[PDB]
Design a protein around this ligand. Structure first.
Ligand SMILES: CC(=O)O[C@@H]1[C@@H](C)O[C@@H](c2ccc3c(c2O)[C@H](O)[C@]24O[C@@]2(C3=O)[C@@]2(O)C(=O)C=C(C)C[C@@]2(O)C[C@@H]4O)C[C@H]1OC(=O)/C=C/C=C/C=C/C=C/C(=O)Nc1c(O)c2ccc(O)c(Cl)c2oc1=O
Ligand SMILES: CC(=O)O[C@@H]1[C@@H](C)O[C@@H](c2ccc3c(c2O)[C@H](O)[C@]24O[C@@]2(C3=O)[C@@]2(O)C(=O)C=C(C)C[C@@]2(O)C[C@@H]4O)C[C@H]1OC(=O)/C=C/C=C/C=C/C=C/C(=O)Nc1c(O)c2ccc(O)c(Cl)c2oc1=O
Ligand SMILES: [Cl-]
Ligand SMILES: [Cl-]
Ligand SMILES: [Cl-]
Ligand SMILES: [Cl-]
Ligand SMILES: [Cl-]
Ligand SMILES: [Cl-]
Lengths: 223, 227
């Protein structure tokens, strides 16, 4: 287990933020530091290891409270906004982890202590805790991975979410006119969210997610 | 102003891209490599398929046409979502690049994708829901399936590179997990390792068990919002 390297990781991060993670190849990160590649490899064997070290490294930028306190909705909300701002700042976090094994670096584990801690006081089987936290973490990640995706897409096409929605209007009408997608149509007729800006959309999605967690907790702990 | 891709034939270009991606991942199936395979030339394909992103979008909807969900909702929403989940996981396992290839913000609105979405969205259509609430609960369900299978594929890919699978990784990491518990700093990590069952089930049993807890949470929200 992979758990001064640190200065290597920081230069990697700087490159990945600007030019994407592919561009943070091992030759370049050397260039960035003013060293030749042969020493880099001593401290950081593989590019897979570096990505893992970068993940943990940037999570160290963030600081949550030492303990969540009893308001699990306010604590998860704080964790949500921190995590979103970290992914927007380091968009490669949304697509870079390709492996199955979890990252057990100190900073990753510190933050999970806080997020798991929020529902840690409840008398739940731990796999139920992980299931509810899974719901919460899934919402934040799906949303922001999609957000990042729009930005990466815009830089190529010059068409962002709002502009894509307008230009897709005619195709959408064709699909409605097909008559084969009555639920898609009811979504297009009735949804409010896509017309909210990003910050308000995220927050209102988070409140719905939090209410679903809440409703589960009332089930397992009436009333 | 480009028109949607959805607005020598297309179907043979796509089926040919799918074969190179199945066997050798989505990178090994470019326009160059797809031309080669068909017995045709680099620029003739750009008539049918302008961009590689356009090509991937067609590849996704093509393979989604291998799954056939029912025409109609059914009152048992738990069974419905379970069927959808099992069918999505089998697909993704047959086409692992499904888990990673979609990197854009815009949704794939091919016909096979939307045919499948009618069934998934129709499952809670029974209920008195504002549409954004429906979408929120479907989001919880889809995120479960998607994280699960994408992690499952991650392990398969990691293991080809390392020759160390999920079980061998848990085994090999015991000493370090034990150092981490001994530090005293990670009490929730310790509890998880001491009490979790899931990662000791096989994948199929673990998939189903997590699904069941998810469905119970959907049920608790439906009861509150729509008695
Ligand atoms: C995330 C996302 O897609 O955001 C979209 C956004 C980018 O665009 C939004 C949008 C576009 C265009 C317009 C609109 C939009 O909101 C204006 O609402 C609008 O319709 C517009 C208009 O043009 C107008 O102007 C227009 O021009 C045309 C029409 C007809 C209406 C309008 O005049 C007026 C109206 O205001 C719709 C909006 O659509 C959605 O939010 C869709 C979300 C639904 C999620 C469904 C997921 C379902 C899960 C699911 O299927 N699970 C899966 C499985 O279990 C599964 C299992 C097996 C398997 O094989 C598969 Cl493939 C599976 O696939 C799965 O996905
Ligand atoms: C997905 C995953 O990690 O699966 C793991 C699997 C691969 O390995 C499992 C495992 C490993 C080792 C062992 C075990 C396992 O089950 C044997 O159970 C075992 O413990 C093992 C042993 O070695 C033994 O043998 C052993 O050898 C050593 C010890 C100490 C115990 C044992 O003798 C007893 C037993 O046999 C644990 C298992 O761990 C989990 O499932 C944990 C899941 C929890 C995820 C929670 C995520 C949290 C979300 C979250 O943080 N959200 C986020 C934020 O809001 C967030 C916000 C801001 C921000 O900056 C960040 Cl970074 C953020 O990051 C976020 O992630
Ligand atoms: Cl990147
Ligand atoms: Cl590597
Ligand atoms: Cl955007
Ligand atoms: Cl290409
Ligand atoms: Cl792939
Ligand atoms: Cl495995």
């Amino acid at each position: 287990s992979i758990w001064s390297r640190d200065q290597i990781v920081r230069a990697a991060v700087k490159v990945a933020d600007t030019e994407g993670v592919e561009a943070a190849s091992m030759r370049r990160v050397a260039a960035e530091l003013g060293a030749g590649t042969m020493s880099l490899y001593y401290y950081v064997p593989t590019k897979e290891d570096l990505v893992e070290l970068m993940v943990d490294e940037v999570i160290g930028e963030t600081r949550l409270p030492d303990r969540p306190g009893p308001d699990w909705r306010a604590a998860l909300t704080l964790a949500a906004n921190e995590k979103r701002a970290l992914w927007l700042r380091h968009p490669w976090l949304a697509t870079a982890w390709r492996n199955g094994h979890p990252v057990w670096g100190p900073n990753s584990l510190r933050q999970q202590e806080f997020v798991l801690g929020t529902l840690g006081v409840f008398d739940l089987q731990v796999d139920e805790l992980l299931s509810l936290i899974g719901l919460y973490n899934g919402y934040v990640e799906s949303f922001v991975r999609n957000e990042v995706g729009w930005l990466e897409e815009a830089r190529r096409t010059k068409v962002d979410m709002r502009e894509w929605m307008r230009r897709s209007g005619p195709y959408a009408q064709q699909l409605v006119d097909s008559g084969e997608y009555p639920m898609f149509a009811r979504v297009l007729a009735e949804t409010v969210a896509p017309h909210m800006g990003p910050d308000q959309r995220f927050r209102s999605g988070l409140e719905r997610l939090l209410d679903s967690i809440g409703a589960s907790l009332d089930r397992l702990s009436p009333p």
